[PDB]
RNA sequence: CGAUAACGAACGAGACCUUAACCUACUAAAUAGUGGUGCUAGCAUUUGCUGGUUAUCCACUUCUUAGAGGGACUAUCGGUU
RNA sequence: AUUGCUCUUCAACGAGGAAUUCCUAGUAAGCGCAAGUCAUCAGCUUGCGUUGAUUACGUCCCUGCCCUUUGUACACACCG
C-alpha cells in the first residue's frame, strides 16, 4: 500500500476550500471553491481527465467556505462567507431553504446521522443548530475568540441516538456538546496556536485537532484525556481518518504528511511536480477528503486545481 | 460663523471656527477618517502541558 | 502610481508588532481580524492597511523586514544561531609564529608548541 | 457540411460558414501570410473576425493596438479630416466595397493585397530634429515596426482621402487603387511617393 | 442603434450559457463559454467604460473652450 | 541590396534634444553575436526586429 | 524607500464625501416590469406566430427603482531594481 | 424688419500668410436634446445622452513655475 498521483480535476478559479463525498455514490465528489460555487463530479476512471463535472450550484454572493452531503447523496448544505446557509439539491439546483441568522461568515457545516438537526459555527462566536425547515434551535456560548470548524462525532455503537459535536476555534479551547440538553461537556486544553482544524475518527473516540503551531494534536474522548501529540513541523489546515484503515492525511503547507498511527510513521510525504510558481511559493492543498471505501485520497489546493492520490 | 461689527470707522468682520472634539459626538463619526487604533492583545503564558477539564 | 502612504504604512507595521502568530499571508482572512481587532472607519482604508499587511508577511517569510521590532522575531532569530561547528577553526589539531611573536611569548614565561617561519619585508 | 433547419430560416450562404471557417465578410484569413518578418507580430491576421466593426478598447496600455485587427486599423484611419468624426458605419461600407473593387479588378485575395500593401509603405529609416543652432539640423535614425504598420495606414489613407476629394471617384474606389499601386509598388502611389521621399532626405543625413 | 445591436448579442450569448448551466451539464457550459470568449470578450462581459462627466470651461469633459492671452 | 533584421535584446533609454528617439542594442539575426548601438524613432519594446539599412554604424546618444 | 544628528508627529497631498460602473445574494413594488390564465383580433392550421384588454385574477423580481450590505486590496504568477 | 412661415432675389467663400489654441479614451471630434435667463426672442452657458478615431505611454528643446549651489554695496527688495 503506497500512494500514486491518478489525476486532476479542473473546474474552478478560486481556491477549493472543501471537499466531501458520500457513501452511496462512489462517482460523487462534491467541492467548494473560493469563487462562491459548487461543483459535483461523476468520478470516471480514466488514466487522463479522471472525473468530470457536472452540476454547478450558483447562489452564494461571498465565498462558500465548506459543503457536507447527505448520507445518500441527494442533498448538500454549503456554508458561505455571506452570513448565510444553503441547502442544494444535487439534480435539480433550486436550493429548498437558506439558514439565516448568523451575523457573520460561517466556516463549517455539518448534517446529522439520521440527517434531523444541522449544526453550524461561525465567525460571531456562536454555534447554532438548526431544523431541516430552517430555525435556529440553540446558541452555544462559552467560546471567547471566533469558531473554526465544526464536526458531528459518529455513532457506530448500536442504539446510541446521542449525537454529540465537536469544535475548533482561534482561542486554542476545544469542547464537547451534548445537543440534546444543550450543555458543554469537555474542555481540552493544550494547543498553544489558532486551531485551523479537527476531526473525529469513525471509531467516534478518538479526536486529533491541529492548528497553526503544527500539532497535530491527539485525544481520546472516549476516557477525555490526551494520547499523544504529533508534530507536523509546518502549518496544517485539514485532517480526515481513513474510514477502514488506522489511518490519518494532514494538509501541512509543504504536502501532504500521511500519518499511520498504529506503529506512528508518516507513510509517503507525497508531493506533486508543478511545473512553473517555483520562486514565491509551491500551491499548497487547503481541503483533503477519503472516499467511502479509503480507495482514494482527495485533495483541493491554492492553484485550483484537485489533485487525487490512490493506494495499492 | 461670520459677523459685521458695524464701527465709527468702517465694518470689522469677525469669523470664528470651532473644531469639536470627535471623541464626545454621540451622534455619527466618533473619530477622524484615518484614525486607526489597534488594541492591545491581553498577553497569556503558553501551557506547555495538553490536560482536558471535565463536567 | 500606487505608493502606500504612512497612515497605511504604519498601522501595518504597529499591527504586526503584535498581531504576528495570529495573522496569514492570505489577504481574505487577513481582511476578516483586523475587521474585528482594530477600528478602521472605513471599508477602503481597512482593504489597504491588511492588502499591506499581507505583503509584509510574504517578506517576512525571508529574512527580516528594517523597522520591526517584536521580542519574538529576533528571538526565534536568536534560537537558529549555534550551526554547532564541527572543529572550531582556531583549534589546530596538528602554531605558527614570527621571530617576534616568539620572544614575546619567551617575554611572557609561557611554553607553547610554537613554529616559527620568516616574515619578511 | 450538413444543413440545419430551424423555426426561424436563416439563408443558407451565412449558414455555411459557421463550421466550415469563420471568415469575413467574403474572404478568407487563411493564405494570408504577410511576407516580411518585421512587420509580423505587427499585423495582426489568423484571428479572423466577420466585420470590420469591433468596439474594442485598445488605447490603454502602449501596444495593444498591436493586438487589433489590421483591417480595423484601416477602417479608423478613414473617419477623419473633420466632418467625418465617429461615422464608423460609414467607414466600414467604404472598405467592404474597396475589397470588392481590389478582388475584382486583380484575382488575387483582396486583404492580401491589403496586407503587402502598408508592409511597402512603411518607411524603413527616418529623420529627426536636432537643433544645431538657429538652422535646424537633421539626423537618420531607424524606425519602429509597430510605427512602421502605423505610418504605413496613415500614409494609404491620406492618398485616398487627397485623391477622391472634389473629383468624380468616389473614395471607395480611390481607397483601392493605391492599395493596389502601393501593394505592387510603383512609386505613382501617394504613399511609395511620401515613403521613398523620407528615404532620400535620411539618405542625405546617412 | 449600434450600441442596441451589442446588446443583443450578449444577451442571446449568455442566455444560452445561462441554458446550458440551468439544465444541461457544465461539460457543455464550458464548451460553450470558452468559444465566446475566445473569439470576442464582450459576448458575455458588459463592457464596463462609461461617460466621462463634463466639466465647466469647456464643451467636453476634457476640451477647455479658447485661450486668449491678447 | 543589403538590409540586416535584427532582434532587439536590451533597450537603453531615450535620447535625443525632445526625447522622442531610444538608444537600442540589437542583435543581428544572421550574424549573431554582433552587437551595436542604434537609435529608434517610434515605440519600441524588445524581441522587436528592426531593419537597418546599415549596419557599419554605431550611435550613442544625441547631444 | 533609503542614506542619515536625528527621533517622533501635525496641517496640506492621501484618507473623507458625492457620483458612475458589479450583484439571477437580502428586503419589496398595477406611479416599474415580465410570464400565465380569463376575453378577444389577425394569420396559419398540429400541438403554433404576433398583437390588443384594465378591475380577468394568481404567482414572480431577471430587467426598472433605493434601502441595507458585499466586492478591489494593483489579488496571483513571472521579470527587473 | 421681436420671433415664426411662404414665395422670390441667391453675395463672399474653391481649405485660408505670419501667428496661435485645446486635447491622451467612451477621451478628441461629429450630432442633437433639456435646463438657466424667458410675456416674446439662442448662433450663449450649465448639463445630458448618441456616434466614436489617429497618436504617445516620452523629455527638458521652447514657454512657464519650483528647488539647489553661488555672488551681492539690494531689503518700499533690479520698476533696487
Ligand atoms: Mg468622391
Ligand atoms: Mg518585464
Ligand atoms: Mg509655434
Ligand atoms: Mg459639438
Ligand atoms: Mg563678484
Ligand atoms: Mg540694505
Given at each position: 500500500e503506497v500512494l500514486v498521483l491518478r489525476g486532476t480535476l479542473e473546474g474552478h478559479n478560486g481556491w477549493v476550500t472543501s471537499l466531501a463525498t458520500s457513501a452511496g455514490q462512489p462517482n460523487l465528489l462534491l467541492s467548494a471553491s473560493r469563487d462562491k460555487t459548487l461543483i459535483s463530479w461523476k468520478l470516471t476512471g480514466d488514466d487522463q481527465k479522471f472525473g468530470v463535472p457536472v452540476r454547478s450550484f450558483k447562489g452564494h454572493s461571498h465565498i462558500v467556505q465548506d459543503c457536507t452531503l447527505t448520507a445518500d447523496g441527494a442533498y448538500a448544505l454549503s456554508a458561505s462567507w455571506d452570513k448565510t446557509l444553503r441547502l442544494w439539491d444535487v439534480a435539480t439546483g433550486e436550493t429548498y431553504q437558506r439558514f439565516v441568522g448568523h451575523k457573520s461568515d460561517v466556516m463549517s457545516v455539518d448534517i446529522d446521522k439520521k440527517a434531523s438537526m444541522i449544526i453550524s459555527g461561525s465567525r460571531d462566536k456562536t454555534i447554532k443548530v438548526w431544523t431541516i425547515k430552517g430555525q435556529c434551535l440553540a446558541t452555544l456560548l462559552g467560546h471567547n475568540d471566533w469558531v473554526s470548524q465544526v464536526r458531528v462525532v459518529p455513532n457506530e455503537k448500536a442504539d446510541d441516538d446521542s449525537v454529540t459535536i465537536i469544535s475548533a476555534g482561534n482561542d486554542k479551547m476545544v469542547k464537547a456538546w451534548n445537543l440534546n440538553q444543550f450543555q458543554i461537556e469537555a474542555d481540552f486544553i493544550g494547543h498553544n496556536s489558532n486551531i485551523n482544524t479537527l476531526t473525529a475518527s469513525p471509531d467516534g473516540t478518538l479526536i486529533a485537532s491541529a492548528g497553526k503551531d503544527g500539532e497535530i494534536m491527539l485525544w481520546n474522548l472516549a476516557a477525555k484525556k490526551a494520547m499523544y501529540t504529533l508534530s507536523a513541523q509546518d502549518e496544517v489546515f485539514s485532517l480526515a481518518f481513513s474510514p477502514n484503515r488506522y489511518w490519518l492525511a494532514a494538509a501541512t503547507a509543504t504536502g501532504i504528511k500521511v500519518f499511520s498511527l498504529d506503529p506512528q510513521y508518516l507513510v509517503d510525504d507525497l508531493r506533486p511536480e508543478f511545473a512553473g510558481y517555483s520562486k514565491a511559493a509551491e500551491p499548497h492543498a487547503v481541503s483533503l477528503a477519503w472516499s467511502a471505501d479509503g480507495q482514494t485520497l482527495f485533495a483541493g489546493y491554492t492553484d485550483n486545481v484537485i489533485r487525487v492520490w490512490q493506494v495499492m | 460663523a461670520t459677523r459685521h461689527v458695524l464701527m465709527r470707522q468702517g465694518v470689522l468682520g469677525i469669523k470664528v471656527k470651532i473644531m469639536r472634539d470627535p471623541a464626545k459626538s454621540r451622534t455619527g463619526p466618533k473619530a477622524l477618517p484615518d484614525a486607526v487604533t489597534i488594541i492591545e492583545p491581553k498577553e497569556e503564558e503558553p501551557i506547555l502541558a495538553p490536560s482536558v477539564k471535565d463536567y | 502610481g500606487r505608493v502606500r502612504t504612512k497612515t497605511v504604512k504604519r498601522a501595518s507595521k504597529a499591527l504586526i508588532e503584535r498581531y504576528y502568530p495570529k495573522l496569514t499571508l492570505d489577504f481574505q482572512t487577513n481582511k476578516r481580524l483586523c475587521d474585528e481587532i482594530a477600528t478602521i472607519q472605513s471599508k477602503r482604508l481597512r482593504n489597504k492597511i491588511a492588502g499591506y499587511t499581507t505583503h509584509l508577511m510574504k517578506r517576512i517569510q525571508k529574512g527580516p523586514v528594517r523597522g520591526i521590532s517584536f521580542k519574538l522575531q529576533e528571538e526565534e532569530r536568536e534560537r537558529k544561531d549555534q550551526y554547532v561547528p564541527e572543529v572550531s577553526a582556531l583549534d589546530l589539531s596538528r602554531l605558527n609564529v614570527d621571530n617576534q611573536t616568539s620572544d614575546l611569548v619567551k617575554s611572557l614565561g609561557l611554553k607553547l608548541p610554537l613554529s616559527v617561519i620568516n616574515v619578511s619585508a | 457540411f450538413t444543413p440545419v433547419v430551424l423555426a426561424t430560416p436563416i439563408p443558407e450562404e451565412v449558414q455555411q460558414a459557421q463550421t466550415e471557417i469563420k471568415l469575413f465578410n467574403k474572404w478568407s484569413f487563411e493564405e494570408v501570410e504577410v511576407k516580411d518578418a518585421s512587420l509580423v507580430d505587427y499585423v495582426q491576421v489568423r484571428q479572423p473576425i466577420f466585420v470590420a466593426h469591433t468596439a474594442g478598447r485598445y488605447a490603454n496600455k502602449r501596444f495593444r493596438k498591436a493586438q487589433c485587427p489590421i483591417i480595423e486599423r484601416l477602417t479608423n484611419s478613414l473617419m477623419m479630416n473633420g466632418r467625418?468624426?465617429?461615422?464608423?458605419?460609414?467607414?466600414?461600407?467604404?472598405?467592404?466595397?474597396?475589397?470588392?473593387?481590389?478582388?475584382?479588378?486583380?484575382?488575387?485575395?483582396?486583404?492580401?493585397?491589403?496586407?503587402?500593401?502598408?508592409?511597402?509603405?512603411?518607411?524603413?529609416?527616418?529623420?529627426?530634429?536636432?537643433?544645431?543652432?538657429?538652422?535646424?539640423?537633421?539626423?537618420?535614425?531607424?524606425?519602429?515596426?509597430?510605427?512602421?504598420?502605423?505610418?504605413?495606414?496613415?500614409?494609404?489613407?491620406?492618398?485616398?482621402?487627397?485623391?477622391?476629394?472634389?473629383?468624380?471617384?468616389?473614395?471607395?474606389?480611390?481607397?483601392?487603387?493605391?492599395?493596389?499601386?502601393?501593394?505592387?509598388?510603383?512609386?505613382?502611389?501617394?504613399?511609395?511617393?511620401?515613403?521613398?521621399?523620407?528615404?532620400?532626405?535620411?539618405?542625405?543625413?546617412? | 442603434h449600434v450600441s442596441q445591436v451589442y446588446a443583443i448579442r450578449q444577451a442571446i450569448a449568455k442566455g444560452l450559457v445561462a441554458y446550458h448551466q440551468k439544465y444541461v451539464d457544465e461539460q457543455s457550459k464550458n464548451e460553450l463559454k470558452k468559444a465566446f470568449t475566445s473569439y470576442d470578450r464582450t459576448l458575455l462581459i458588459a463592457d464596463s467604460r462609461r461617460p466621462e462627466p463634463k466639466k465647466f470651461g469647456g464643451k467636453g469633459a476634457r476640451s477647455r473652450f479658447q485661450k486668449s492671452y491678447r | 541590396t543589403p538590409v540586416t533584421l535584427a532582434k532587439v535584446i536590451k533597450v537603453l533609454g531615450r535620447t535625443g534634444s525632445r526625447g522622442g528617439v531610444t538608444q537600442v542594442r540589437v542583435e543581428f539575426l544572421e550574424d549573431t553575436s554582433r552587437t551595436i548601438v542604434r537609435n529608434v524613432k517610434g515605440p519600441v519594446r524588445e524581441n522587436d526586429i528592426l531593419v537597418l539599412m546599415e549596419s557599419e554604424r554605431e550611435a550613442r546618444r544625441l547631444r
Open positions: - | - | - | 467625418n468624426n465617429g461615422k464608423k458605419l460609414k467607414a466600414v461600407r467604404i472598405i467592404k466595397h474597396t475589397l470588392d473593387i481590389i478582388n475584382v479588378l486583380t484575382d488575387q485575395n483582396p486583404i492580401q493585397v491589403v496586407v503587402d500593401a502598408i508592409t511597402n509603405t512603411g518607411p524603413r529609416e527616418d529623420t529627426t530634429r536636432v537643433g544645431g543652432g538657429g538652422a535646424a539640423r537633421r539626423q537618420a535614425v531607424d524606425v519602429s515596426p509597430l510605427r512602421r504598420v502605423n505610418q504605413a495606414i496613415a500614409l494609404l489613407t491620406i492618398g485616398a482621402r487627397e485623391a477622391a476629394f472634389r473629383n468624380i471617384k468616389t473614395i471607395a474606389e480611390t481607397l483601392a487603387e493605391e492599395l493596389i499601386n502601393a501593394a505592387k509598388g510603383s512609386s505613382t502611389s501617394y504613399a511609395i511617393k511620401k515613403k521613398d521621399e523620407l528615404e532620400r532626405v535620411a539618405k542625405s543625413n546617412r | - | -
